[PDB]
Design a protein around this ligand. Structure first.
Ligand SMILES: *[C@@H]1O[C@H](CO)[C@@H](O[C@@H]2O[C@H](CO)[C@@H](O)[C@H](O)[C@H]2NC(C)=O)[C@H](O)[C@H]1NC(C)=O
Length: 429
């Protein structure tokens, strides 16, 4: 609610006039509580019995329009009943009508400002809610309200017409309704004017995302009712990663330490998954502790995991022209079950005439040893080893790996076993 003219303020703020001189009369009184009150009266009806007709106007000072598009007016007034006056069959009324006119400049100093020939626009005729003049303080004081269609010039005048009533204007209040600036739906909306055209019409208002918000792909919008309230919205922003709603649809606050928020929007932060920390606020993800990782496939809400330890309990057995390597699971799997194994083969030479200080050649196997499923990428703790030579001594190493350890190797954890093919000379004691 934004005031453009109030009679109960700074004593009246009055420069008004009356078209037929003496048509309206300013009479000042004391109101129910203590206060000087400028009021205007028109009761010519008690004059000549023909009346000779009544057309007595009362015009305001130029009202600046400030930004209002739709002016509301609130009148307080007494009206004397026609039954309670001299014999005034016909000529007496109990109503007055109400007008406005627009101007972009106050009325033309002294050289046009006898108005009344200017095009006045009618607003409505007003009547009292019944059951000279003068407010007695018996709450004969009627209150009525009306409003004027769109205001576009710099200001306006308002005029009052008495055509046979015994009237006492007591108070006038000219205002417009405004919608307050507000935080709604994670956005800010400005103070917004304007019914404009009248009661049903709305005025559309654009919002900006508050601290740490984004649109909801939708860029926000909110609508200003003709009485200053905010009718229903479209769109709205959402909070940002690392930020959660706070004070309710109204702001976004950073996650506290040890919490995070991966993603989109109006959703509270959640505490860090296993083996991660959020050392600081506004965390979008909790990084893993030293020695732990998250795989390609791991979302930020996954716990962090680690690479495996070495395979255990290597052993083997011969089956025809080939040899089967066996082992068991690592004692530490890092909290993931995408464990798979890799086997390396080495043919080792060694202790003969030269190189008596660790003299094993230990090259890798030839291209004629094909391991039965794969040699690399095994999910099972076994492999069949193909074409390895008769007395040549081999060494078979088994590496463990899982879905991290792309992420840091240190070299993969491993185990190996000395292996020699054939056996002879039965036991004699
Ligand atoms: C596989 O066999 C080799 C050779 O027989 C083993 O080698 C030696 O290990 C001892 C201590 O255990 C060292 O003192 C020697 O110097 C090593 N030899 C050489 C040539 O360096 C080896 O330990 C065995 N490893 C497995 C896993 O079976």
């Amino acid at each position: 609610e934004e005031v453009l003219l109030d009679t109960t303020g700074e004593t009246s703020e009055i420069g008004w006039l009356t078209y037929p001189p003496g048509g309206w009369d300013e009479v000042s009184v004391l109101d129910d509580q203590r206060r000087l009150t400028r009021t205007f009266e028109a009761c010519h009806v008690a004059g000549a019995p023909p009346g000779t007709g009544q057309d007595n106007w009362l015009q305001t000072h130029f009202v600046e329009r400030r930004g209002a598009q739709r002016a509301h007016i609130r009148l307080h007034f007494s009206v004397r009943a026609c039954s309670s006056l001299g014999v005034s069959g016909g000529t007496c009324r109990e109503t007055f009508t109400l007008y406005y006119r627009q101007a972009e400049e106050p009325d033309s100093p002294d050289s046009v400002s006898s108005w009344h020939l200017k095009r006045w626009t009618k607003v409505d005729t007003i009547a009292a809610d019944e059951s000279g003049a003068g407010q007695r303080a018996g709450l004969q004081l009627n209150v009525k309200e009306r409003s004027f269609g769109p205001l576009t010039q710099r200001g306006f005048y308002v005029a009052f017409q008495d055509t046979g009533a015994c009237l006492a204007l007591v108070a006038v209040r000219l205002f417009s309704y405004t919608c307050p600036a507000v935080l709604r739906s994670f956005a800010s909306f400005p103070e917004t004017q304007a019914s404009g055209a009248g009661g049903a019409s709305l005025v559309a208002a654009v919002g900006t995302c508050v601290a740490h918000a984004e649109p909801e792909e939708s860029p926000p919008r909110l609508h200003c009712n003709g009485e200053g309230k905010w009718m229903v919205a479209v769109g709205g922003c959402r909070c940002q990663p690392g930020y959660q709603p706070a004070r309710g649809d109204k702001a976004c606050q950073a996650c506290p330490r040890g919490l995070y928020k991966a993603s989109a929007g109006n959703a509270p932060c959640s505490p860090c998954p296993a083996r991660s920390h959020a050392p600081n606020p506004a965390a979008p993800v909790c990084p893993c502790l030293e020695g732990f990782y998250r795989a390609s496939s791991d979302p930020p809400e996954a716990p962090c995991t680690g690479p495996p330890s070495a395979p255990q309990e290597l052993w083997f057995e011969v089956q025809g022209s080939a040899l089967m390597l066996h082992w068991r699971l690592p004692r530490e799997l890092g909290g993931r079950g995408d464990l798979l194994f890799n086997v390396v083969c080495k043919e080792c030479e060694g202790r003969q005439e030269p190189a008596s200080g660790g003299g094993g050649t230990c090259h890798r196997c030839r291209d004629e040893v094909h391991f039965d499923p794969r040699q690399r990428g095994l999910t099972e703790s076994r492999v069949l080893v193909g074409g390895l030579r008769a007395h040549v001594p081999y060494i078979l190493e088994v590496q463990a790996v899982n879905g991290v350890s792309e992420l840091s190797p240190d070299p993969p954890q491993a185990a190996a076993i000395n292996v020699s093919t054939s056996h002879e000379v039965p036991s004699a004691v």
